[PDB]
Design a protein around this ligand. Structure first.
Ligand SMILES: CC(C)C[C@H](CNC(=O)c1cccnc1)Cc1ccc2c(c1C(=O)O)OCO2
Ligand SMILES: CC(C)C[C@H](CNC(=O)c1cccnc1)Cc1ccc2c(c1C(=O)O)OCO2
Ligand SMILES: [Cl-]
Ligand SMILES: [Cl-]
Lengths: 148, 148
């Protein structure tokens, strides 16, 4: 459980927002990309795995599950690539609610940033710091408990 | 101490590698940028602070210390912007040695990646996972101890 992440891809202003959620904590990392390609997803995963101990990734769709570049990145980084099928149906709703929450924050900061990518990073900040512990506090505690 | 980061800017293949080091652990985050501008540094700091609890940043040079965009990002993210003057002279050497180590890793992976930005992220991964604890383990423990 401390090593499990879920990929999530949402759309805003004609651009794509790629999100990784740490399932146990609700902590996120996100980036704006022109389009969701295997290459972009692969690069995003390399970044993520160098920063947190990523053991398993539930991919966001079949295309990224199939992509040879995504598979190469998962091999390189020692990540077990799994499907993101919501065998527990509440998983879909939780992800959907997070996407709505994130878009709401983006709208609230949108004026403070010229570029969407900046607004997204502000939204990541606000999400991870929101309290009662924050997602940022929870991910650290979960992982620290695991090491020890 | 758990909230203190140091910025570091090094050069390779005619491009700029911007690095943030968590001083107490040796954990790093890095990005390739065309050139070190206030705007790029500001954006990098927004990303960093959404992901880890950044309380203080020792800026890498006077230009970034002075930059109004960097100051705006530090204000936004609740970061205390400080100088990076090595009042303890061993600080310069430690940073220099890390830059050499990182360039060495980049050279060792350079063949596995078409693009420098990819090689840099692979180097971040290898640095943070290198064991006796790893930098990734140390940053988590330090921060977890602080919350508790
Ligand atoms: C820290 C925040 C409060 C301001 C900072 C500077 N922007 C403005 O002053 C501004 C505000 C409103 C309208 N137009 C500009 C945001 C920022 C930082 C770095 C970047 C950016 C941006 C961006 O504006 O997207 O783009 C890529 O590198
Ligand atoms: C996971 C590694 C092992 C391979 C992966 C794909 N590259 C190759 O197969 C390859 C290797 C050597 C020469 N030409 C191609 C690397 C990668 C992933 C995502 C990206 C990339 C790159 C990149 O190659 O820089 O560029 C931005 O998005
Ligand atoms: Cl790690
Ligand atoms: Cl945080």
């Amino acid at each position: 459980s401390p090593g499990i992440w879920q990929l999530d891809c949402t759309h805003l202003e004609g651009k794509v927002i790629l999100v990784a959620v740490h399932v146990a904590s609700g902590y996120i990392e996100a980036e704006v990309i022109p389009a969701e390609t295997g290459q972009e997803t692969a690069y995003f995963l390399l970044k993520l795995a160098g920063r947190w101990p990523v053991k398993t990734v539930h991919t966001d769709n079949g295309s990224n599950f199939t992509s040879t570049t995504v598979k190469a990145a998962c091999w390189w980084a020692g990540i077990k690539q799994e499907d993101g099928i919501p065998y527990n149906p509440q998983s879909q709703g939780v992800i959907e609610s997070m996407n709505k929450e994130l878009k709401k924050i983006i709208g609230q900061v949108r004026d403070q940033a010229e570029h969407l990518k900046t607004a997204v990073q502000m939204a990541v900040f606000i999400h991870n710091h929101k309290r009662g512990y924050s997602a940022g506090e929870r991910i650290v505690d979960i992982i620290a408990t695991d090491i020890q």
